[PDB]
Enzyme design. Structure first.
Site, PDB file in Angstrom:
ATOM      1  N   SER B 130      -8.181 -10.605  -6.134  1.00 34.71           N
ATOM      2  CA  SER B 130      -9.351 -10.127  -6.883  1.00 34.71           C
ATOM      3  C   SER B 130     -10.578  -9.857  -5.973  1.00 34.71           C
ATOM      4  O   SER B 130     -10.492  -9.078  -5.007  1.00 34.71           O
ATOM      5  CB  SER B 130      -9.670 -11.100  -8.030  1.00 34.71           C
ATOM      6  OG  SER B 130     -10.567 -10.550  -8.981  1.00 34.71           O
ATOM      7  N   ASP B 223      -4.434  -3.927 -16.046  1.00 38.68           N
ATOM      8  CA  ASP B 223      -5.560  -4.415 -15.255  1.00 38.68           C
ATOM      9  C   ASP B 223      -6.538  -3.269 -15.040  1.00 38.68           C
ATOM     10  O   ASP B 223      -6.148  -2.218 -14.549  1.00 38.68           O
ATOM     11  CB  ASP B 223      -5.061  -4.935 -13.896  1.00 38.68           C
ATOM     12  CG  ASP B 223      -6.172  -5.546 -13.041  1.00 38.68           C
ATOM     13  OD1 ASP B 223      -7.367  -5.353 -13.363  1.00 38.68           O
ATOM     14  OD2 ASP B 223      -5.839  -6.220 -12.033  1.00 38.68           O
ATOM     15  N   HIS B 253      -4.609  -8.628 -14.829  1.00 43.58           N
ATOM     16  CA  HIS B 253      -5.406  -9.204 -13.744  1.00 43.58           C
ATOM     17  C   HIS B 253      -5.350 -10.734 -13.739  1.00 43.58           C
ATOM     18  O   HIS B 253      -5.557 -11.378 -14.774  1.00 43.58           O
ATOM     19  CB  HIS B 253      -6.863  -8.734 -13.852  1.00 43.58           C
ATOM     20  CG  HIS B 253      -7.619  -8.796 -12.559  1.00 43.58           C
ATOM     21  ND1 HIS B 253      -8.468  -9.838 -12.243  1.00 43.58           N
ATOM     22  CD2 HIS B 253      -7.658  -7.942 -11.505  1.00 43.58           C
ATOM     23  CE1 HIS B 253      -8.962  -9.644 -11.033  1.00 43.58           C
ATOM     24  NE2 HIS B 253      -8.515  -8.483 -10.578  1.00 43.58           N
TER      25      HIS B 253
END
Lengths: 283, 283
Positions: B130, B223, B253
């Site tokens: 991320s 995502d 995600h």
């Protein structure tokens, strides 16, 4: 080029791929219901006991065989650290559907009932690429009908349906090695009649997919078969089966066969190895 | 609902996760140019020499730390069979961009300079998830400019750019854990002024990507960051850099964080495992 010529080319081209050293190689004959099925057994370098992968080459049900798939099967064996058994099912057009399916199921039943031959205490799995991924998936369905409990199925860009509708088929049906014309011609060799398109043994998408073993499904961005692959993953997930669906971007259909010079192919062989090591061994 | 309380929930619903055994574990403190940087060094159960992975936790530049990423980093170490170094960079909003980048490059500079302390003859790699994946990609850019030669970069659902335009952002921006509101709020906590959107150290996509280390890039289907992750991969490819871009289907995600309950997460950890063993050891 003739069908025979092209079959010859497959094996010729394969002598350009480096052949990884393995534990031990053995050519066996399997007693099948309609024929005697040749198979090669690849042992890994580590020491048993083992899980066993029964593998089915792609090639459109027309092409491919044990020799031309010998480099790929070695590399899978080292990666999976498992016994690999590569099956020479009968090929069309000489042997129409459902010959390749009968061979592929017979082989598996047999390996399943003879797993001590290979110290195969850790369980059985099926896998294959393309037409071969079709054979693996169908084989796993038939297995459920016989109360044969498999550990896993590895489906590498599988063909799972007759297809006139996917976007991926139209986006990708030219310029990426496997063309529309190829898909049609393959189908003409393999199938007996239009009625076969109703048969779950040709289009496994048709089947009830509950209680099938957990699966790894690999699709390729620039592949006409991409969308149907993911549909199969989706329906499995829908029927309550665990599945890891994975699209490799930037590559074409067949790309795993081309691992020596397409690194994403090497990495897929790596992923396949890992999930089999994990379900067999707990690693 | 405040920042400290939010942080607290992360650490708590992460305390429950059983922790994988590794070899041995050592907290260190790196001399940062702006601060003292805590780091936790994870050794595998095999024995050196080793490759080294410098890893950067995600959490939007605002959450996350060494304790709460402790299960994941253990899991990564056993998979990669590689010395893993979890870096505890300065968090926002207390420490604004480019604080977390300065730490993240400082720590890498130092590990590179001191690799015999970990017995890392096989070289250095960077990775994270991320915002963590951002940090890692920026770090590899900064390394190029100072002739620090990295072996690999591992980018797990990276944030690579400010985004008002990708399909995946609109398709996936509600309902899938990581939402429009969150992306916005994180970026507000993290950035100083609109001039920062010009800065390649917030948006690595801006940079000249020539001569970076080869990459694994993992995206998630549902995502909002998916398309940009994938663009980063294609931009690397255009710049002559080998990369293996892979979309995990059926997942959101953050999925890797959830590897105990989400098996695609585990399988992702295995792929990373694999690509690091390959480039470090040849295995």
């Amino acid at each position: 080029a003739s069908v025979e010529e092209i079959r010859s080319l497959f094996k010729q081209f394969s002598s350009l791929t480096p052949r990884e050293e393995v534990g031990k190689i053995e050519d066996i004959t399997i007693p099948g219901s309609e024929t005697n099925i040749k198979a090669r057994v690849y042992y890994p370098k580590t020491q048993g006991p083992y899980g066993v992968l029964v593998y089915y080459h792609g090639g459109g049900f027309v092409l491919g065989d044990i020799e031309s798939y010998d480099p790929l099967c070695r590399a899978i064996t080292n990666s999976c650290q498992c016994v690999t058994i590569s099956v020479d099912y009968r090929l069309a057009p000489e042997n129409k559907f459902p010959a390749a399916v009968v061979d592929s199921f017979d082989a598996l039943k047999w390996v399943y009932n003879n797993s001590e031959k290979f110290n195969g205490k850790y369980g059985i799995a099926v896998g294959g690429d393309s037409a071969g991924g079709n054979l693996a998936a169908v084989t796993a369905i038939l297995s459920k009908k016989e109360n044969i409990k498999l550990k896993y199925q590895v489906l590498i860009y599988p063909a799972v349906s007759f297809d006139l509708i996917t976007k991926s088929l139209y986006d990708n049906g030219e310029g990426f090695f496997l063309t529309r014309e190829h898909i049609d011609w393959f189908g003409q060799q393999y199938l007996r009649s239009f009625a076969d398109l109703l048969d779950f043994r040709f289009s496994p998408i048709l089947a009830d997919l509950n209680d099938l073993p957990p699966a790894l499904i690999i699709t390729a961005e620039h592949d006409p078969l991409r969308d149907q692959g993911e549909a199969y993953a989706n329906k499995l997930l829908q029927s309550g089966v665990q599945v890891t669906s994975v699209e490799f971007n930037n590559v074409i259909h067949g790309f795993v066969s081309f691992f020596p010079f397409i690194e994403q192919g090497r990495d897929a062989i790596g992923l396949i190895g890992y999930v089999l090591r994990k379900v067999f061994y707990g690693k």
